[PDB]
Ligand binder design. Structure first.
Ligand SMILES: [Ca+2]
Length: 240
């Protein structure tokens, strides 16, 4: 996250770090949202590579012991069947990970609340992106979890010529685009948290930014719209 601030430790307890084995160590690659004690919601493109993955819940600092983490392997990966890695603009950038063990819930580890099916947010609705992604375009991962205020940009504005044009679909949420704050590489798969009727809910799964850079005016960060996939998510969890 570019232009972010450090999140308090128990503000976003459904945020997870998705990591892959790298020789003797583990490397952060993406975010995700804990949605069941044994299921994580993330972006399909995050699990495109045939790597060994683990989830860390209760994580705040990737380079220090926080004394709150739980580490669990990924037992099964279900990518949306319409996902195509050479066409992120088509959508369907979502996947579910079944964890090998169920995690324990506490003030650092909670389930993400998902919106009702079909919910679309009014233009300029208040949302926060969270993640350990790059803090500058072509920069480096954050050590501590970051948050940035990204108000939504509705479909008619976001799909206009000056913004993303045909690249954005109604199965997506746009947020931000102010030129200062944005998602960045390493934030993919994590949540977009939006305040509705007094409660934060995870309306988006981080998916893409401009090839020109992360924080680019009129290229808001784009997210898979969770509320378009509620039946898909329930169908997988039920059938798995
Ligand atoms: Ca840590």
């Amino acid at each position: 996250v570019v232009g972010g601030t450090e999140a308090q430790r128990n503000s976003w307890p459904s945020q997870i770090s998705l990591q892959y084995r790298s020789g003797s160590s583990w490397a952060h690659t993406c975010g995700g949202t804990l949605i069941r004690q044994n299921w994580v919601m993330t972006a399909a493109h995050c699990v495109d590579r045939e790597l060994t993955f683990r989830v860390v819940v209760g994580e705040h600092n990737l380079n220090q012991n926080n004394g709150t983490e739980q580490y669990v392997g990924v037992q099964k990966i279900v990518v949306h069947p319409y996902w195509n890695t050479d066409d992120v603009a088509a959508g369907y950038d979502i996947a579910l990970l079944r964890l090998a063990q169920s995690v324990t819930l506490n003030s650092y580890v909670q389930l993400g609340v998902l919106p009702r099916a079909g919910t679309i947010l009014a233009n300029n609705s208040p949302c926060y992106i969270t993640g350990w992604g790059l803090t500058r375009t072509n920069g480096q991962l954050a050590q501590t979890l970051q948050q940035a205020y990204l108000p939504t940009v509705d479909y008619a504005i976001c799909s206009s010529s000056s913004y993303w044009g045909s690249t954005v679909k109604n199965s997506m949420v746009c947020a931000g685009g102010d030129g200062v704050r944005s998602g960045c590489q390493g934030d993919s798969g994590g949540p977009l948290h939006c305040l509705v009727n007094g409660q934060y809910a995870v309306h988006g799964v981080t998916s893409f930014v401009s090839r020109l850079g992360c924080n680019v005016t009129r290229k808001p960060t784009v997210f898979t719209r969770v509320s378009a996939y509620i039946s898909w998510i329930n169908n997988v969890i039920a059938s798995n």
